[PDB]
Design a binder for these strands. Structure first.
Ligand SMILES: [Mg+2]
Ligand SMILES: [Mg+2]
Ligand SMILES: [Mg+2]
Ligand SMILES: [Mg+2]
Ligand SMILES: [Mg+2]
Ligand SMILES: [Mg+2]
Ligand SMILES: [Mg+2]
Ligand SMILES: [Mg+2]
Ligand SMILES: [Mg+2]
Ligand SMILES: [Mg+2]
Ligand SMILES: [Mg+2]
Lengths: 117, 63, 102, 52, 151
RNA sequence: AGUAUGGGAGAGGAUGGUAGAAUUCCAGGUGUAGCGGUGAAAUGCGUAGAGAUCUGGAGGAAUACCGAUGGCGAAGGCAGCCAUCUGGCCUAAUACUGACGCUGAGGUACGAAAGCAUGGGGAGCAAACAGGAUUAGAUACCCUGGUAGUCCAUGCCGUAAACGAUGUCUACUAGCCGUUGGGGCCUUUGAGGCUUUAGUGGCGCAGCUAACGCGAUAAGUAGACCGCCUGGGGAGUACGGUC
């Protein structure tokens, strides 16, 4: 229903999973997709292939409003950081810019303990 | 980061530039450290080992 | 697992010994079951017709389903002692191999 | 060094806002300490950003 | 092997059709070095299939072979104590070899009186699109498609 | 050995205030299927609206980058920023006291972390404990939760591989290359090159050592004082006594 000219991409990449969320400005969400959601269960859930598949589906779903410009915000480590953004352009979008949003504590809370695997 | 794409900038080249900028910044490396808690003894041991390695590299350089 | 036990002329063998060896060996190694398909034990007396502290040699060789056959030897003064030593050594060897291969 | 010499202070700050090491700046240790103190004071007074 | 690069041998073309592909197929059919019976079987099958529809036997054979050739396969990779079946592309020689082997095995498992008849039936079935070799091609595509995620 | 006067560096100590990042919890906007975790799973969370994303509040704890064979402290040990109180150290000249020194049985003070008593606080982490996995078995390793504790105030406890495994003080004995805080000299192109001193490092002659190795920061050559050892176990144990 609502038509938005511009959008924002949020790519939350982790070792286990990757999530892509297409929103408008001010944070209201338009569409979202996840590697596990697009099949690819298990160790393959972290593969960059699932990342670009999820990016494709999410971008195609969000293309209904017809927004032609968006800015990418990438969070966290893990595969898909580049595959998802490549898929964003492949879908037909025009990315204004790409920026990083990784949270870096300034020596705050104590991390968990080692894994003696 | 805040890399702005040029009018003729390819998306792949923009991604490459973003990767280079992130690598120079080193923000990604800091995240991996916060996964675990490093005890002070281990931290000091690693720092002294790194210092010894740097000095050895220097000596090899002017030698 | 099929059991094939053999002795030499010095040792002297009997079907009673066959039954006892089969029973004891199966009882000890019952845990592995399907992991292992064949046992062959062999008994000798080395300097036959004389004596000594060991003077008897027991061997057991086992085929594990999958990995290659594995063998164990022991020397002792009596048949029972030789069998017990060989059983202990086999148990240790199989435990080590299975822990290694996980 | 002074927290008011914002241009000189910014000469030693990366885009992220982090303090550049003495190794690659080429400054003395004595100069580096005062530089860091002035940078922290300017950060507190908001003359220069903490991050980004 | 750990060294060297063994070169491939040359298969002479068949007498009737002068086709190296048909000669290789005869070699797949052959058992115990009975190549004369192999040629008899293959040529009887080719005549039988030609009877159904009037086309070049060589063209029919190569078309069915292309129909039955594979696209993608996985090769088991043992890392971290897991199978990790990884899809990969395969060389044309392997493509042709698996296609021929599947055709011959499917014919062998068919249920006609003679090897020539059941080989001809398998060729017709592969041309139509429903056969055991077609099913193995479908299964390999299905599995390499399920595991596409890994490189 | 010490005193008075000028300067210098410093995470030395105690008290109070304050800044941003991040985590957790709580409300609301958009939105509809997964999230999370692993070698693979499972437990767990979510169609009673989870996850992602934006906004607004609550509280706790620690201070990214600078940061370094860097610095300070008798040792233990000390890391944002500002103010108050406070100890030691380095460096220069002049002026003073005239051996006022070193060590030190007993004794006495300080003394990581865990633990204890009383009263507060509790975000994250996590002994015990519960579940899920692996395993022949799992009383563990791995995953999901989680109490004491970790934090604050006042006391007790007297222990560590509390380690350069190397007691303190003093004098002498090739050289070469770093770095930190001062002092001096000369060139200058606004920065450099040489010297002395107090720390902290890498090599190395002689000398020493069973060997490895030490080597002006000695494990070398000498002097003063203290502590300590006499084959491996039983054993830092029992008994008595002190706390
Ligand atoms: Mg003999
Ligand atoms: Mg003999
Ligand atoms: Mg004294
Ligand atoms: Mg004393
Ligand atoms: Mg736990
Ligand atoms: Mg206090
Ligand atoms: Mg006390
Ligand atoms: Mg002691
Ligand atoms: Mg210590
Ligand atoms: Mg000691
Ligand atoms: Mg006692």
């Amino acid at each position: 229903t609502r038509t938005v000219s511009e959008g924002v991409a949020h790519i939350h990449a982790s070792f286990n999973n990757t999530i892509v969320t297409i929103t408008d400005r001010q944070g209201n969400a338009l569409a979202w997709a996840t590697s596990g959601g697009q099949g690819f269960r298990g160790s393959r859930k972290s593969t960059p292939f699932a990342a670009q598949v999820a990016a494709e589906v999410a971008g195609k779903a969000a293309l209904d409003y017809g927004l032609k410009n968006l800015d990418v915000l990438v969070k966290g480590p893990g595969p898909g950081r580049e595959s998802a953004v490549r898929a964003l352009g492949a879908v037909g979008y025009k990315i204004n810019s790409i920026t990083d949003v990784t949270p870096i504590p300034h020596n705050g809370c104590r991390p968990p303990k080692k894994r003696r695997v | 980061p805040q890399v702005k794409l040029k009018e003729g900038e390819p998306v792949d080249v923009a991604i490459r530039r973003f990767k280079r900028s992130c690598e120079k910044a080193g923000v990604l490396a800091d995240v991996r450290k916060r996964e675990f808690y490093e005890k002070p003894t281990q931290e000091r041991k690693r720092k002294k080992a790194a210092a010894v390695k740097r000095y050895q590299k220097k000596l090899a350089r002017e030698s | 697992m099929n059991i094939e036990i053999r002795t030499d002329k010095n040792i002297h063998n009997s079907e009673r010994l066959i039954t006892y060896v089969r029973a004891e060996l199966t009882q000890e190694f019952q845990r592995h079951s399907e992991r292992i398909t064949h046992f062959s034990v062999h008994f000798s007396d080395e300097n036959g017709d004389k004596g000594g502290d060991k003077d008897i040699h027991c061997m057991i060789e086992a085929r594990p389903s999958g990995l290659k056959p594995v063998a164990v030897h022991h020397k002792a003064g009596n048949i029972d002692a030789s069998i017990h030593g060989a059983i202990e050594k086999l148990k240790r060897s199989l435990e080590h191999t299975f822990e290694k291969k996980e | 060094i002074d927290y008011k010499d914002i241009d000189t202070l910014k000469q030693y700050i990366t885009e992220n806002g982090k303090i550049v090491p003495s190794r690659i700046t080429g400054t003395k240790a004595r100069y580096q300490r005062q530089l860091a103190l002035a940078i922290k004071q300017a950060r507190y007074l908001s003359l220069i950003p903490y991050t980004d | 092997p750990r060294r060297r690069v063994v070169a491939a041998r040359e298969i002479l073309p068949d007498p009737k059709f002068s086709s190296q592909t048909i000669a290789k197929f005869m070699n797949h059919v052959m058992q115990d070095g009975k190549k004369s019976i192999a040629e008899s079987i293959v040529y009887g099958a080719l005549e039988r299939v030609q009877e159904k529809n009037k086309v070049d036997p060589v063209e029919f054979f190569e078309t069915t072979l292309e129909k039955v050739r594979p696209m993608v396969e996985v090769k088991a990779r043992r890392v971290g104590g897991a199978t990790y079946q990884v899809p990969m592309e395969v060389r044309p020689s392997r493509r042709t070899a698996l296609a021929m082997r599947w055709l011959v095995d499917a014919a062998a498992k068919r249920s006609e009186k003679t090897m020539a008849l059941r080989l001809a039936g398998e060729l017709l079935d592969a041309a139509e699109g429903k056969g055991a070799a077609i099913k193995k091609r479908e299964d390999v595509h299905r599995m390499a498609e399920a595991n596409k995620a890994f490189s």
